[PDB]
Structure formats: structure tokens, C-alpha cells
Design an enzyme around this catalytic site. Structure first.
Site, PDB file in Angstrom:
ATOM      1  N   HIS A  79       0.777  -1.236   0.000  1.00 35.90           N
ATOM      2  CA  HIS A  79       0.000   0.000   0.000  1.00 35.90           C
ATOM      3  C   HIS A  79       0.803   1.277   0.000  1.00 35.90           C
ATOM      4  O   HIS A  79       0.245   2.366  -0.125  1.00 35.90           O
ATOM      5  CB  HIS A  79      -1.021  -0.006   1.158  1.00 35.90           C
ATOM      6  N   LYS A  99      -4.394 -10.436  -7.500  1.00 35.46           N
ATOM      7  CA  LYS A  99      -5.113  -9.679  -6.493  1.00 35.46           C
ATOM      8  C   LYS A  99      -6.110  -8.731  -7.139  1.00 35.46           C
ATOM      9  O   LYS A  99      -5.733  -7.885  -7.936  1.00 35.46           O
ATOM     10  CB  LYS A  99      -4.151  -8.892  -5.614  1.00 35.46           C
ATOM     11  N   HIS A 115      -3.328  -2.507   7.997  1.00 36.29           N
ATOM     12  CA  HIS A 115      -4.445  -2.792   7.123  1.00 36.29           C
ATOM     13  C   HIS A 115      -4.928  -1.553   6.410  1.00 36.29           C
ATOM     14  O   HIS A 115      -4.900  -0.445   6.951  1.00 36.29           O
ATOM     15  CB  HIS A 115      -5.581  -3.397   7.928  1.00 36.29           C
TER      16      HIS A 115
END
Length: 120
Positions: free
Chosen positions: A12, A38, A112
Site C-alpha cells: 500500500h 489480487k 491494514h
């Protein structure tokens, strides 16, 4: 184990896009998100300190179900798998974006990214 924060940066964080077009297909391979392909993934750009700061009130507000939401907006890029098929070659559509983000902090580290806000 900070391995979850580590896997976060890897999935990310891309400090500086080089250019943010479909040619997604690279950073998703370079980052190991293509076996299986993904389905959606978003990279945050800019400096780390700033993304890290979402972990207190200095850039973060509580959100949903124990997820934080950034006060500021980040240049971002969303890679969406195109073709429906789960196996490489993985072909991606890029979408640049600029907005705040939703994350999960654990002991003050991101672990996350809530991908739902980019699925739009």
C-alpha cells in the site's frame, strides 16, 4: 512481529509513482500480488511520516469498527484486475485518486488498508 506493518508498506505504500497508468501491472508484480491475481489494490503515495500519523489524532479519527480515517487526503492509485480471470498474466486498470484513507492501526502502526472505499 511488525511483519503486518511491513506487509502493509509492501501492499500500500509507493512513495513516488513514476507515472500512474495501467502499465499497475508492474508494481503489482514487483510487490508479489499476482499469484493469484489480487483483484483490487491501492497504493498510497507521498511521505511515510504522514501516512504513519493517521495513527493518532494528528491525522486520524476513529471510524466504523475500530478503523481510523485520515484527516488529510493522499495521492493514491487503485489497481483493478481486468478480465475476471485469477491467473497471470494479470492485467490492471489504473485509477489515480486523491482523498482521505481508511486504515487499521495496531500499537500505532498501520497493518491494514480498507479497500472497500476504492472499490466504487
Amino acid at each position: 512481529d511488525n511483519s503486518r506493518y511491513t506487509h502493509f508498506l509492501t501492499q500500500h505504500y509507493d512513495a513516488k509513482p513514476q507515472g500512474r497508468d495501467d502499465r499497475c501491472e508492474n508494481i503489482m508484480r514487483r510487490r508479489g500480488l499476482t499469484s493469484p491475481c489480487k483483484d483490487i489494490n491501492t497504493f498510497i503515495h507521498g511521505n511515510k511520516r504522514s501516512i504513519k500519523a493517521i495513527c493518532e489524532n494528528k491525522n486520524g479519527n476513529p471510524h466504523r469498527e475500530n478503523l481510523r480515517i485520515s484527516k488529510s487526503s493522499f495521492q493514491v492509485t487503485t489497481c483493478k484486475l481486468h478480465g475476471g480471470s485469477p491467473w497471470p498474466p494479470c492485467q490492471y486498470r489504473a485509477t489515480a485518486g486523491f482523498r482521505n484513507v481508511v486504515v487499521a492501526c495496531e500499537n500505532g502502526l498501520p497493518v491494514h488498508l480498507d479497500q472497500s472505499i476504492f472499490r466504487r
